Symmetry: C6
Subunit: 246 residues, 6 copies
């Protein structure tokens, strides 16, 4: 499995939440590996869009060192009918069942389910397939850890899937001026002086931006002349904030 | 039929409800076997998710000692169209009809019917097949006991299926501190001292957790260091409770 | 045609309604046989679930002594598409049209129409086929009596089918303590003493239970020890009553 | 074309409405035959169920003496898909277009359109086919009179079809005690004395029963002993009345 | 192209609106022919049912003298699936694109789109095809004038098609007693004396009848005896009026 | 790729917004070309209908000088099923992925998605394909800039697509009398004197017309006699304004 594809810009420790996600992930891996009572363990990584769910799921899977690791993604099922998706999924789980210790990542569940809020509309046959697969224990003695990711926990709850996962792990956006500065420093993009200015403008204030989104705002800001990079970054950050009124 | 698959962690007598379910199940088995008036008997085991419905249904079926016993599960029908499911079901009942005394378990009815609350949506052709099969007597002189399971009695009622079953048996979650401790003791997971602490924290208080869910919380708690296992268990139990406001 | 299959436990005269149903049925048979003005006569037997509609329809058909008698049932059309059901129905009526005097029973119309209250949903193509067949006179000079059965008169009315039948015959549940005792006596299940006790508990009081449902409650009660059979029967009857508030 | 099939019990002159329907029908036939301006004329016979629409349409068509006369009925299209019905209809009109003077009866439009009030549901492809055919003039110089029938004028109006017909002719139920007695006398069913009694009970009072329905009530009443025939007829008439409150 | 088929009863100048429609049509033809900036021009002729939209569209197209003129009509697509209609349309436009100067009439858009107000229902694939075709310029240097007709401008607006047309031309019903008399005179149907009477009854009063509908009322009135023709005409006109309350 | 087809009447600098759109477009092109962090950049050009979105998107793409440039348009997918559209799209992106630096324009998204406000209705399979493609990075090291266009930003937001684009660029209609005059002058259509008159009538006043729509109004006005061209233009502009009440 190619993780570089799912962890294109590493896993930077911008804040304690990152460590929490990884540590809780390892606990589930350990449980899956050593428990006879629960040979099947499932966890849903959920949070706001762009918070870093897919990369963290891939990282947890990578760190498991399991003999079988497979990531189920919407990427190679574009245009697939409900039945075709179900068959592709059954194939992945069937292969996993042949391993003594396996990890399957079901990435971007709302996309796998062809979900759209207007209606709403979605592929029920695929939803039903997942509900069954999430509860199906591998052959006696074999173990499986299923890691799902979503930016729509609310929808999955309404679909009664949230109750199918053993547990869920929240993957929050960067939420404080300090976490933001930590991310910038670890990413090493602005000049020492520019970060001091940014810190002056954000420290103490609340922020709400996903790590993936932060990468984009940084690159956009860097296209500006040196004198305007910080101004541009702060303006973009101002537009990518959380609605005070919702 | 492989029951070990459906009764992976035994049938522990955590409380009187367990005995009630099994005893009422045996009465229905006896009626099916000895009655000429009602050669067809059906019962719906229903309760909250994870309360132990499938395992108990499998146990009732196993204890019947009937020459023909078959469990109809969503597991091998993932991605199946409505028609395909109906044919798979007709096959099972047709085989049952060839036996003088048979028991068919129709497990996880909401999943067999591809039910989802959003809409709602479901496979009506499959619902109709079940409504007919639940009322169809085997060839004259032959007997059949149908045992269905569901975590959604309300939905089946609205579908007018609840009225198709001869009777229903409630499979409750563990509901008292005493039943909880009994389960823990029978499962033998915590140290004698740890259970005393748990008893101190739960005795007298109300609880509402399904046996299957309890197994998961236990295993999660055991991944903690010895000094933190009880704290973790109680915290998880606190999150898996019933909403006081609904 | 096998009536034993549709009249598994006879036709007991538990009350005057039974005689009324049969007498009105014979009048329609006579009209169909002797009228030149109305060579096509249709009647809908309707009532609460389990009231005995199918058995009575089969009995009316049997007593007609017509050269052609066929019962159209959902039993052999499980999983059938709308088109497949329509073709199966057309076949039955086409065969009937070849006879000078025929009777076709269209049993469990809500099931033939794949009806479910959620939505609601149903097979309109099948509904339309029935609406046409109910009004189609056999070849000139030939006669046909169509007997339909349903537990959902309200739904058929809304579908404008009720207006397609020549008339309807109500098949009520047992409604008085006296009719209940008459049924028990004719079925001869309890000891002379046990019926006196039951009579003491129900006489004068209102009841509302279908004959088919009564058979089931009796058999369930008989699985109890002799000393507890009556207590069990009365408890079950108490649960199978009509809602005072609806 | 077999009219005997569509006019099984003649066309009795029970009241002035019958003459009106036939006279207006002949005027349309005359217009279709002699007009160069309107080579295509369409008329919708509409009224309550059982009022005699189909028989009158067939009679108007028969009296036209047109070289081409065809009745399009739901009878031979049971189970037909929308496309199949459209093709069957196109065939009839295509044949009509080959005649210099033709009459096509489109009978029971609500049934041809697979209409049901629940939803509602209907075959839009068939509706669209009719909307186009109702407005399509035959080849230059050729003439066509289209006669449709329905018991649901309201629905056709909502479908914007009512506006596609050149005009409509109301086919009312028998509405007065005098028209009722006239029908009975012309049908010659009761004894001279029995009609005097009926007249005594209905004269001056309002009635609302379709001629086809009247035929059925008469036959049902005749199955009674001589002394009870009138009582039965009046009781049935009492149940087949119009709701004072709707 | 056969215009006689679409202009069966000529184009009479009953009022100024007729001249306006034709003059505005010619301006669009001229623009299409001489403009390099707008090689693609589209216009929607819209008005009440029977106002004469199709005939006027055909007339505008005929007067263009364009080397390629094609009328797309629902007439030869009865029973066609959405895909089949789209292909038929693509064929017409593809042929038009091969001409240096073309005119395509898309007649009765609501019928091409299988529109019905109940639901509503319509063929979205066909709507989408039209939305694209209405905005697609012919190969560089080639010109195309698209003329659509509809009696449902409101619906097309809601479908966002009205915004796809370059402009729209209103085709009103005859709206004044004077325009009505002008039409009658040009059609030359009543006796000189009869028109004086009609004028006496309508002059000064408002009217609202489509030219096509007027043709029908005239022919119906002519089927009456000479003494009753005017009375009949006025009575029919009275029924074909506009609702004062809507 | 043929841009002349998508930029039929050039890109005139009628106002500062035009320069803004092009400059922001170039910044995104530069970012796509030089960034390692964001190899995938997407931008949605959105604005009122006819504001010039497609031409500007094509211009931004043309100015990128990328080795691979492809415009995905609804034009060659008329009548295509959802699956067929998805396959056509996958083909374009797959080809783009083979290039080191590519630009794909996804034009008229509401049309690609078969969107209609009534219902609403749309092709969810196509929407899902776009949601995945908008987030899929090209093979490691390769770069892709996706430029979408729409006149319905609101709808895309509700579909959660707006959140899939890296950013959006507003393409406004001409909004001031000065911008209008600048457009007219650059297009060089009216006589020096006529523009002075127009300026007199619009200067200081607000306007809201898309450049593409302006081209049409100009051509329509030019079909008038010299003395009436300005009057016609102003009248048309008066009808193509923004609703003060919405
Ligand atoms: N601590 C971190 N956690 C997660 N991703 C990180 C972290 N540090 C850097 N990244 C990078 O940030 C990006 C996160 O993208 P991704 O994992 O696709 O987000 P996502 O929340 O799954 N997106 P979406 O599914 O679009 O909401 C990847 O390029 C990661 O390599
Ligand atoms: N008394 C008991 N009753 C039922 N299951 C028990 C009992 N004691 C232990 N178990 C175990 O608990 C688990 C119950 O799981 P299961 O029977 O699948 O629950 P369920 O309620 O059918 N689940 P779901 O269908 O997901 O709501 C099995 O592993 C059983 O072996
Ligand atoms: N008087 C009676 N009328 C009808 N059935 C009777 C009577 N006496 C005994 N029975 C028996 O009671 C049973 C009635 O079952 P059935 O005719 O299937 O009921 P139903 O109302 O058609 N059921 P459902 O369609 O499930 O509502 C049969 O076994 C009959 O033989
Ligand atoms: N004056 C009459 N008008 C019409 N039918 C008549 C008349 N006199 C006798 N009849 C008979 O009455 C019956 C009318 O049935 P039919 O024409 O099918 O009614 P309908 O209104 O079309 N029925 P439906 O379509 O079920 O509402 C036929 O048998 C006719 O022969
Ligand atoms: N000035 C006129 N304008 C239009 N049609 C005219 C005129 N004078 C006479 N006619 C005739 O009136 C008829 C109009 O019919 P048509 O053009 O089909 O109307 P329409 O409004 O398109 N109908 P519909 O689509 O059913 O609303 C044709 O027979 C024309 O020849
Ligand atoms: N500054 C400009 N920006 C955009 N288009 C321009 C400009 N100047 C001239 N044009 C021309 O104006 C027309 C714009 O049409 P187009 O780009 O299709 O608009 P659109 O907003 O994409 N249309 P739609 O998709 O129908 O809302 C083209 O012919 C352009 O060549
Ligand atoms: Mg992700
Ligand atoms: Mg279960
Ligand atoms: Mg029945
Ligand atoms: Mg009829
Ligand atoms: Mg027209
Ligand atoms: Mg565009």
């Amino acid at each position: 499995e190619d993780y570089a594809s799912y962890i294109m810009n590493g896993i930077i420790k911008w804040g304690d939440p990152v460590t929490r996600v990884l540590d809780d992930g390892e606990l589930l891996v350990q449980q899956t590996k050593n428990s006879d009572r629960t040979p099947l363990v499932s966890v849903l990584l959920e949070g706001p869009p762009h918070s870093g769910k897919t990369a963290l799921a891939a990282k947890i899977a990578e760190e498991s060192n399991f003999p079988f690791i497979k990531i189920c993604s919407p990427d190679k099922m574009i245009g697939f009918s409900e039945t075709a998706k179900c068959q592709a999924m059954k194939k992945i789980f069937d292969d996993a069942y042949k391993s003594q210790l396996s990890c399957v990542v079901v990435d971007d569940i709302e996309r796998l389910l062809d979900y759209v809020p207007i209606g709403p509309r979605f592929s029920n046959l695929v939803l039903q397939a997942l509900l069954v697969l999430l509860k199906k224990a591998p052959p006696q003695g074999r173990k499986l850890l299923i890691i799902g990711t979503t930016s729509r926990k609310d929808v999955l709850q309404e679909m009664e899937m949230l109750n199918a996962f053993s547990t869920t792990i929240h993957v929050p956006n960067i939420a404080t001026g300090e976490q933001l500065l930590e991310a910038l420093e670890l990413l090493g993009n602005f000049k020492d002086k520019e970060r001091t200015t940014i810190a002056q403008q954000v420290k103490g204030k609340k922020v709400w931006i996903g790590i993936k989104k932060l990468l984009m705002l940084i690159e956009m800001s860097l296209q500006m002349d040196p004198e305007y990079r910080v101004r541009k970054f702060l303006a973009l950050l101002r537009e990518e904030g959380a609605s005070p009124l919702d």
